[PDB]
């Protein structure tokens, strides 16, 4: 098959700037390349066909260039609705092959995580389990650390973390952390603390509560 190697794997850029990522085919493909845009979670949308053709209804900010085995998609005046993963496809011989993708992230002002903590619901405690959930919303950058404390002692295991995709509006990220305990060991302590360590502040953002109290 024809191997499509595109770079970089991902890149960060500021609102309004101009970016380009290349695609290198294992052999010449005579401009038989398509550029695809994939918003996180959603489907695809063919932006450019045959190397340099802009599908109708697609902003002129997008433009493709190249020939032989080397092609480049170039986005200018980056707007808020351009934050996606970008793939290149070749269709000059079978089978049609794709690139690895290029995740395009947006740069913005550093934001503080708005933290909320939630004790186990009444319903979950009746089954035999207990989950303490901590939501960290609208922060930047993506990199952030979360630490769980029960009665002052740090608990490591039993913690699952899930980050959202970059919000395509405010350009911020969000995260949830869930501490999963048994009902027994949950009703044996009083203090549950969820603290975030982000570059936006040297002082950790802390949320906590006391069981029943």
């Amino acid at each position: 098959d024809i191997l499509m190697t595109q770079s970089p794997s991902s890149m960060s850029v500021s609102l309004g700037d101009t970016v380009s990522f290349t695609c290198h085919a294992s052999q010449g493909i005579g401009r038989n390349i398509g550029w695809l845009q994939q918003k996180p979670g959603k489907s695809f949308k063919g932006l450019i066909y045959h190397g340099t053709n802009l599908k109708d209804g697609v902003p002129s900010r997008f433009s493709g260039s190249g020939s032989g085995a080397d092609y480049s998609l170039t986005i200018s005046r980056i707007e808020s609705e351009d934050f996606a993963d970008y793939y290149c496809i070749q269709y000059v011989q079978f089978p049609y092959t794709f690139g690895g993708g290029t995740k395009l992230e947006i740069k913005r002002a550093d934001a503080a995580p708005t933290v909320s903590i939630f004790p186990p619901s009444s319903e979950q405690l009746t089954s035999g389990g207990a989950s303490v959930v901590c939501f960290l919303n609208n922060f930047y950058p993506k990199d952030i650390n979360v630490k769980w404390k029960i009665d002052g002692s740090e608990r490591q295991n039993g913690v699952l973390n899930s980050w959202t995709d970059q919000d395509s509006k405010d350009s911020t990220y969000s995260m949830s952390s869930t501490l999963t305990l048994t009902k027994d060991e949950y009703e044996r302590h009083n203090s549950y603390t969820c603290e975030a360590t982000h570059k936006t502040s040297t002082s950790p953002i802390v949320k906590s509560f006391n069981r029943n109290e």
Binding site: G30, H50, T52, G68, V92
Partner: peptide, 23 residues
Amino acid sequence: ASVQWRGLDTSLGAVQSDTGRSV
């Protein structure tokens, strides 16, 4: 510089274009 044969909706990969020639 671009030169291109107007592709038809009945083909896919029929045109091989460059900057000074298209087949």
